Write a protein that binds this ligand. Structure first.
Ligand SMILES: *[C@@H](C)C1=C(C)C(=O)N[C@H]1Cc1[nH]c(/C=C2\N=C(C[C@H]3NC(=O)C(CC)=C3C)C(C)=C2CCC(=O)O)c(CCC(=O)O)c1C
Ligand SMILES: *[C@H](C)[C@H]1/C(=C/C2=NC(=C\c3[nH]c(C[C@H]4NC(=O)C(C=C)=C4C)c(C)c3CCC(=O)O)/C(CCC(=O)O)=C2C)NC(=O)[C@@H]1C
Ligand SMILES: C=CC1=C(C)[C@@H](Cc2[nH]c(/C=C3N=C(/C=C4\NC(=O)[C@H](C)[C@H]4CC)C(C)=C\3CCC(=O)O)c(CCC(=O)O)c2C)NC1=O
Ligand SMILES: C=CC1=C(C)[C@@H](Cc2[nH]c(/C=C3N=C(/C=C4\NC(=O)[C@H](C)[C@H]4CC)C(C)=C\3CCC(=O)O)c(CCC(=O)O)c2C)NC1=O
Ligand SMILES: C=CC1=C(C)[C@@H](Cc2[nH]c(/C=C3N=C(/C=C4\NC(=O)[C@H](C)[C@H]4CC)C(C)=C\3CCC(=O)O)c(CCC(=O)O)c2C)NC1=O
Ligand SMILES: C=CC1=C(C)[C@@H](Cc2[nH]c(/C=C3N=C(/C=C4\NC(=O)[C@H](C)[C@H]4CC)C(C)=C\3CCC(=O)O)c(CCC(=O)O)c2C)NC1=O
Ligand SMILES: C=CC1=C(C)[C@@H](Cc2[nH]c(/C=C3N=C(/C=C4\NC(=O)[C@H](C)[C@H]4CC)C(C)=C\3CCC(=O)O)c(CCC(=O)O)c2C)NC1=O
Ligand SMILES: C=CC1=C(C)[C@@H](Cc2[nH]c(/C=C3N=C(/C=C4\NC(=O)[C@H](C)[C@H]4CC)C(C)=C\3CCC(=O)O)c(CCC(=O)O)c2C)NC1=O
Ligand SMILES: C=CC1=C(C)[C@@H](Cc2[nH]c(/C=C3N=C(/C=C4\NC(=O)[C@H](C)[C@H]4CC)C(C)=C\3CCC(=O)O)c(CCC(=O)O)c2C)NC1=O
Ligand SMILES: C=CC1=C(C)[C@@H](Cc2[nH]c(/C=C3N=C(/C=C4\NC(=O)[C@H](C)[C@H]4CC)C(C)=C\3CCC(=O)O)c(CCC(=O)O)c2C)NC1=O
Ligand SMILES: CCC1=C(C)/C(=C\C2=NC(=C\c3[nH]c(CC4NC(=O)C(C)=C4CC)c(C)c3CCC(=O)O)/C(CCC(=O)O)=C2C)NC1=O
Ligand SMILES: CCC1=C(C)/C(=C\C2=NC(=C\c3[nH]c(C[C@H]4NC(=O)C(C)=C4CC)c(C)c3CCC(=O)O)/C(CCC(=O)O)=C2C)NC1=O
Ligand SMILES: CCC1=C(C)[C@@H](CC2=N/C(=C\c3[nH]c(C[C@@H]4NC(=O)C(C)=C4CC)c(C)c3CCC(=O)O)C(CCC(=O)O)=C2C)NC1=O
Ligand SMILES: CCC1=C(C)[C@@H](CC2=N/C(=C\c3[nH]c(C[C@@H]4NC(=O)C(C)=C4CC)c(C)c3CCC(=O)O)C(CCC(=O)O)=C2C)NC1=O
Lengths: 177, 164, 106, 245, 164, 177, 177, 164
């Protein structure tokens, strides 16, 4: 776990000098951005449960072999483990949104999950499909273009931050496969 | 590293919750206190050389017996070490000043410094003479803004109060 | 702490089990008096880190006999306490013993 | 969220693909046994290449005054390319190396148990057998126009058997950096001329031996074995599929 | 109770440290977000009655089968209970709104609510109909301030996302 | 590779004595059986490809998540590797039928199959389902009770042998899981 | 564990109604105060180790029976435990300064301390003397009337808050006895 | 081990085919020749003791210099070793006789025997005297059936022609 700040500081420590203005200017873009990231995290963390439910239900909708006997979603046990895994994924993504760096996501969740799912026989393609659906649903919430729930926000441009969030979900989906 | 957002995310991660509005208010305080201490960070990266120079010169101005031939700092290379060591300290004050909190200054400089300095016959009172010299030479209005100055004071005091 | 897993999979599984135990203990965000508590007085946390890593090294150096006995013991004991004729968890205890040793939870 | 703070275990894909991981912490032991055991096979067949004690013509390794070191750099990079494989390539190699080690075992029960038991050990048996015997593609020498021609044709059909796709895989990889190619070209030419300078009965038993590898690769075909009776370099041209190339 | 101050305090107590600038910064966020939330708390103490009345009336407007004589809410005392239950919920939204974070709303209302509502045959979708009715009847400028309203939104959504 | 003969001889070598009338009596049951095993092997080896086709087709039929995109049967290449794997499984099963002992099946096919399928992400429960269908189809051909093809044979009792073949399929299906 | 906020909320919950404007008005006095509490806690937490050294040294100075043999400060070990106990007391006092309520002080430090010192034979009057000296030293720092160190602060009155901190140290000194 | 069904299954495995009618005819010949050599196996398990005893006694009846004080067979323990070795040989003839082929007799007895016998000063002509003594004492009708006897002859001759 390293935020934006600690990332700049560690890079300056490897460079072995003081941080300087340049890095401080990019940091002023982060802090000067601020409550766009705050309102964004408020949006994803608001509609969290519902994102996870819709995404995994859609994932079972694309291929009904999971809920077919012998599939990895065939029981209540397996379905519950499925739902909590999608929830934990969304959780760490939101952590990485407030953090501004993916250090927490890389260390605490990503590092050793692929081998683990392979050892347990979780199908990875299905997981990346679910990560993709959570990606689209979460970017649609974060841009407030969700067609069901559309709340009042102070207007402006926050596409760059949506690009950041898309990058973290692409990191997870690239990692699980 | 100890910081605002790492404390809050760490707590939410240990609890296994989503980040609720409490962490949002914490990072609100982070993004509001930011500009001040980053200004102080800019000026520290400005004139760190004269800071180290006055720090070490006043350090040996107080303690002359170090350049006597018992005590460690009695050669030009080891006065370069004493000066070099201070430079580390001011750079970690810059790092922790940028981060917010005492994270990098604690985990790089303070943690286990007791065994090192107590092992290598290094007196802490020399360091504290240097830092308190810089803290007394500091300023209210003339170099910095007062508010940011307070942040700098905090970090420097922490170093002193983490030493002895 | 004494038991060391023999795979990347048992690292992540074992880690996850331990996390889930401590999260089952304390739902609320505030830390609870007691618990882990590395810090009492300043300068404690670093010694905690050092004693922890040293005990990890002695946990690493152990013999074949000791290791195998610890794995059978941890599998059985954690089954007797936390696996109640449930083939999933009986399987994932006998399969990976370090997860069971995380399941001891005492 | 990893359980072990210090020296957390990281078994290699090869270690995991195999059954080496175990309760006893054998993975250290089995992995080590394989490495030591594998060298033993190689040193045995290197003992068979030079009975008399002086290094043969086969082990020359370099004519230019710094080309030996170049071969050392190239050998380690080739092992690194062997390590960069995917999952399916690894299981494909362990099964085909397994079956070829068993077909070279000539029915010895004990050996067959020790090839299934130690997949890593078997692969170096295949390679080192085929190098010591002399029945290998590198040691092919055409002796008519038609041998040279059909090694061109046969060779091309083997390379089409290996890469059906247009993408060149990891297995070919002539160079690592700049200037590697010309040096590999130099040493590759020095290998062929070096083969020209062998002794006589070595070349005769190499011919017979390449025919014997031809009969096995050919399996049951009168046609193919008729051609191997016509031309013996084709039996050297039967590479295994556990090479790419 | 889960709050920014408790987290900063809890983190420092678990670490064993004096409160450095990080908790101070976290506190600054508390004292800066405070007014927006407390205004919303004032207005919630203003018109909670009409909130509960429209909430429960729209709740049975959606789900009529509850007043049928199977399902639970089929007597005047239990409609008083359903109305009463909601009033607890809005009062907890006022409590958590004044506190800052999800502390009292979690530890009084949410923790172990699953066993009780699953035991006493109580559907969550009726509650969610109530909360979402209030969230759709909300407003941008006419009753409240917009920014504080966002805080209210968050809390109400948390209740929904803690319920199903 | 050890047949029934080599198994008796290895057992007598671990016992460190001569052969003896008991083990020779079980060997006289083997030899006296004989052409029942011959005709059995002829039956399964005759209809082998068709068994593989039916069993894999049924396996895709129970859960269409295989043929769903993201499933391991969604391509012609993955389907071809599927068909050749079923075929090679049945090939080693027929080897174990001629042998009388599962040594060839344990060494040449079973030793490192689970790890292989885990490394490739092959769903193990679907493989055990395919082995189960090949079990029932192979016992139905071996008893000549197949409702499509029923060829004329010299009459008798071959239940024991069916039990042996069922034991081999249960060994494979137990191994893949 | 209860701050100002949580104390208002708990009192309203025992009253069983909503919080209202009166309790919110007192809370607006708290929030409107704000950075005086921040600067206060910064002052005590800055010079904290120094305060513990001076106070405990003064405590030994008034009655040298503690450093006399048989006294509880007679050894290096027991002097160390003495100094860390003074430090921890000051730690929880600072926590009660940020909290605004003595809930953290009552629960996390005060709960079982008198019994513990009775069980160890620590003299309680000596402890109340040391808490008194930490009180005087800490109020002198918090008013910035310290005789050695006098730092720049934006001008104003902080006496209320010093009365709060004096209340906490009188709570600790009354508790240890 | 080298045998009929292992040669055919090994050939089908190396070829990658189903076992066709050719392997079926091979194991047909195995199950037709089987009863004869298993009868010879029964009688070998019958009287192996007197076979080893007359074998070794005639072996030292031919070669007396072995009990001379130079060579290995000069002590009672090593004559026990010589008899014991012959017992292993007859047991290998029984094993390979039961199997069919020369598989266990080759891989247990013949493989690597040259280095051991050549190392430990062991003459092969003594073994060949023993085996040829048993082969000359054999019989046509009295103990065995003639055809199975031929199988026994084959195995014993194989031993001799694998020895020198
Ligand atoms: C107990 C299981 C804990 C839970 C639950 C939790 O969320 N975190 C645990 C308690 C905790 N620990 C700290 C602070 C530190 N802990 C340290 C020890 C580790 N650091 C190491 O390098 C090693 C060896 C590899 C260990 C064992 C150290 C050091 C610190 C920081 C010390 C400092 O001076 O600040 C904390 C506070 C930080 C946080 O997580 O918010 C907590 C709650
Ligand atoms: C209204 C939308 C429901 C329903 C409500 C009923 N609730 C009943 C019982 C009950 N409800 C709660 C939750 C409530 N108590 C609290 O202390 C708090 C928060 C602090 C809440 C939110 C509890 C704990 C209980 C059990 C104790 C009690 O009886 O009060 C209830 C009675 C059920 C029965 O006895 O059968 C009803 C009817 N009525 C409905 O029609 C809809 C579904
Ligand atoms: C503690 C919680 C907390 C929040 C939830 C935020 C909420 C918030 N957002 C903004 C402010 C803003 N918020 C956004 C965000 C948006 N951009 C869009 O395209 C979308 C509609 C939307 C993201 C989904 C933008 C663009 C601004 C700046 C608006 C402007 O200046 O025009 C402001 C005014 C101050 C500022 O400029 O930062 C506030 C209070 N702040 C907080 O303190
Ligand atoms: C990055 C941060 C940063 C700082 C905070 C300053 C701190 C600082 N001040 C001085 C130096 C100085 N600072 C002061 C200031 C003072 N005059 C007084 O009457 C008051 C006591 C006090 C203001 C409140 C003075 C007078 C000097 C010159 C001292 C001298 O030459 O005698 C020096 C030595 C180099 C110089 O002469 O400029 C340094 C490092 N410099 C930095 O680079
Ligand atoms: C990241 C932070 C960081 C630091 C703060 C320093 C701290 C530090 N100083 C020394 C080492 C040293 N530090 C000093 C300094 C002193 N000379 C004196 O006369 C004074 C008492 C004092 C300056 C005020 C000297 C002289 C040595 C060498 C000591 C010796 O070898 O005898 C060492 C041992 C390694 C070395 O020899 O360099 C370390 C870790 N190093 C770090 O990495
Ligand atoms: C990496 C491997 C790994 C495992 C094997 C599990 C093992 C495991 N199960 C539970 C927890 C649980 N496991 C079960 C399961 C059971 N329900 C019953 O009726 C049966 C007896 C049994 C299934 C056969 C239940 C019900 C709980 C929750 C128990 C409770 O909260 O009361 C917990 C505590 C955390 C939690 O609540 O999830 C853990 C560590 N977790 C892991 O990380
Ligand atoms: C210049 C000389 C020259 C040769 C002699 C051949 C030899 C040869 N045959 C095959 C390849 C093949 N050869 C055969 C032939 C056989 N089918 C059987 O039933 C019998 C055992 C045998 C005939 C007697 C088959 C079936 C293949 C394809 C094997 C497969 O894909 O499974 C290949 C691999 C490339 C390919 O698929 O075509 C090559 C190099 N090719 C050459 O370029
Ligand atoms: C090389 C090819 C080859 C064959 C094709 C078989 C063919 C064959 N089968 C039998 C003989 C037999 N074959 C079987 C087989 C069975 N009868 C049943 O009713 C079952 C359905 C079926 C097993 C699945 C049986 C039971 C006999 C003995 C009695 C009979 O004639 O049915 C015989 C007579 C000799 C004997 O008794 O063994 C022959 C020649 N043998 C061979 O060597
Ligand atoms: C996170 C770290 C952090 C700090 C270090 C403080 C720093 C700080 N203090 C004040 C502001 C203030 N700070 C104090 C404090 C006091 N003044 C006195 O004369 C007393 C001696 C002393 C209490 C012991 C006072 C009274 C003010 C308001 C007026 C002033 O500037 O003095 C302000 C301006 C905003 C405000 O009015 O609150 C700031 C930024 N705030 C923070 O958030
Ligand atoms: C599985 C089959 C099998 C065998 C056939 C034997 C073969 C055999 N014999 C010996 C070893 C021996 N064998 C003999 C026998 C002889 N004494 C003589 O006078 C005669 C020449 C001859 C009997 C005819 C003797 C004397 C030794 C010991 C030799 C020595 O130590 O000098 C050894 C070395 C190990 C040992 O000392 O026992 C072996 C492998 N062992 C086996 O495991
Ligand atoms: C013809 C047998 C055969 C060989 C030799 C083979 C692979 C192969 N071995 C090769 C090399 C190679 N292999 C060996 C081993 C070797 N040579 C011998 O004469 C004996 C008895 C050996 C050990 C069994 C040497 C000395 C070399 C030359 C030095 C070097 O290049 O490292 C090469 C060339 C490029 C490369 O390094 O990959 C190749 C392509 N594949 C085969 O079938
Ligand atoms: C009879 C009990 C017993 C004990 C306590 C023992 C060894 C032992 N474990 C010890 C420590 C120790 N052992 C544990 C073990 C532990 N952790 C767990 O999660 C569980 C379930 C544990 C029980 C095995 C902890 C938490 C600690 C405290 C952390 C620490 O102090 O490092 C100690 C104290 C000194 C040390 O750190 O080594 C000792 C002496 N050997 C024993 O047989
Ligand atoms: C029949 C099996 C099945 C499903 C289940 C859905 C699942 C689903 N939701 C999507 C995507 C999706 N889902 C939601 C969330 C959702 N919409 C809302 O307005 C509210 C309130 C929601 C939670 C209740 C949003 C907001 C989107 C983005 C598209 C949009 O603007 O609605 C997408 C598009 C994925 C992509 O873009 O790659 C899919 C596949 N689709 C199926 O075929
Ligand atoms: C002989 C044994 C002995 C001691 C040791 C001292 C210890 C001591 N310091 C005090 C109190 C005290 N101490 C300091 C801190 C101190 N002063 C400074 O200006 C600087 C820079 C300091 C650290 C170096 C301050 C600031 C006060 C408050 C009084 C004042 O304004 O100086 C008080 C008064 C306690 C009270 O008010 O109840 C005592 C007893 N007294 C003794 O009798």
């Amino acid at each position: 776990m390293l935020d934006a700040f600690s990332r700049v500081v560690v890079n300056s420590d490897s460079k072995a000098a003081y941080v300087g203005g340049s890095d401080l200017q990019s940091l002023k873009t982060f802090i000067s951005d601020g409550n766009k990231r705050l309102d964004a995290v408020n949006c994803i963390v608001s509609n969290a449960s519902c994102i996870v439910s819709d995404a995994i239900s859609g994932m079972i909708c694309e291929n009904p072999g999971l809920i077919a006997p012998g599939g990895n979603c065939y029981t209540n046990r397996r379905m519950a483990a499925c739902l909590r895994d999608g929830e934990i994924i969304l959780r760490y993504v939101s952590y990485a949104l407030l953090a501004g760096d993916s250090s927490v996501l890389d260390d605490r969740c990503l590092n050793g999950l692929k081998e683990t799912y392979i050892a347990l026989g979780v199908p990875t393609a299905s997981t990346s499909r679910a990560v993709s659906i959570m990606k689209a649903a979460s970017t649609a919430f974060i841009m407030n273009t969700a067609s069901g729930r559309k709340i009042e926000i102070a207007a402006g441009d926050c596409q760059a931050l949506q690009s950041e969030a898309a990058a973290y979900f692409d990191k997870v989906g690239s990692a699980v496969d | 590293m100890k910081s605002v957002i790492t404390t809050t995310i760490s707590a939410a991660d240990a609890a296994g919750r989503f980040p609720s509005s409490s962490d949002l208010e914490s990072i609100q305080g982070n993004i509001q206190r930011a500009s001040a201490r980053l200004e102080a960070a800019e000026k520290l990266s400005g004139n760190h050389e004269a800071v180290v120079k006055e720090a070490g010169d006043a350090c040996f101005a107080k303690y002359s017996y170090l350049k006597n031939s018992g005590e460690a700092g009695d050669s030009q290379e080891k006065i370069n070490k004493c000066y070099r060591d201070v430079d580390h300290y001011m750079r970690l004050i810059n790092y922790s000043l940028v981060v917010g909190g005492t994270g990098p200054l604690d985990e790089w400089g303070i943690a286990g410094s007791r065994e090192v300095y107590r092992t290598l016959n290094l007196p802490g009172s020399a360091y504290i003479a240097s830092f308190t010299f810089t803290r007394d030479r500091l300023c209210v209005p003339r170099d910095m803004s007062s508010q940011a100055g307070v942040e700098f004071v905090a970090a420097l005091d922490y170093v002193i109060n983490s030493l002895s | 702490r004494t038991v060391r897993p023999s795979s990347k999979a048992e690292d992540y599984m074992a880690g996850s089990v331990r996390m889930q135990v401590y999260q089952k203990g304390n739902a609320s965000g505030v830390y609870p008096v007691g618990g882990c508590e590395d810090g009492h007085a300043k300068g404690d946390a670093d010694l905690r880190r050092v004693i922890a890593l040293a005990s990890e090294y002695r946990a690493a150096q152990q013999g074949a006999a000791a290791v195998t006995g610890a794995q059978y013991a941890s599998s059985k004991m954690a089954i007797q306490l936390y696996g109640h004729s449930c083939n999933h968890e009986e399987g994932q205890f006998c399969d990976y013993p370090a997860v069971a040793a995380a399941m001891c939870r005492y | 969220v990893l359980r072990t703070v210090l020296r957390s275990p990281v078994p290699s894909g090869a270690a995991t693909v195999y059954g080496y991981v175990g309760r006893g912490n054998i993975s250290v032991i089995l992995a080590k046994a394989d490495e030591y055991m594998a060298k033993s096979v190689r040193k045995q067949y290197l003992a068979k290449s030079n009975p008399y004690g002086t290094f043969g013509v086969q082990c020359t390794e370099g004519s230019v005054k710094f080309a030996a070191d170049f071969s050392r750099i190239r050998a380690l990079n080739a092992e690194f390319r062997a390590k960069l494989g995917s999952a399916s390539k690894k299981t494909f190699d362990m099964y085909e190396n397994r079956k070829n080690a068993i077909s070279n075992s000539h029915g010895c029960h004990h050996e067959e148990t020790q090839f299934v038991g130690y997949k890593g050990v078997s692969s170096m048996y295949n390679v080192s057998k085929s190098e010591a015997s002399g029945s290998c593609s590198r040691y092919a020498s055409p002796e008519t126009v038609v041998e040279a021609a059909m090694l061109r044709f046969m060779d091309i059909q083997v390379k089409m058997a290996a890469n059906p796709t247009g993408v060149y895989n990891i297995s070919c990889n002539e160079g690592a950096a700049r200037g590697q190619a010309e040096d590999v070209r130099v040493a590759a030419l020095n290998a062929a001329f070096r083969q020209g300078q062998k002794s006589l009965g070595k070349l005769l038993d190499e011919k017979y031996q390449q025919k014997k590898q031809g009969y096995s690769f050919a399996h049951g075909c009168n046609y193919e074995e008729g051609l191997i009776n016509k031309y013996p370099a084709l039996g050297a041209a039967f590479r295994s599929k556990s090479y790419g190339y």
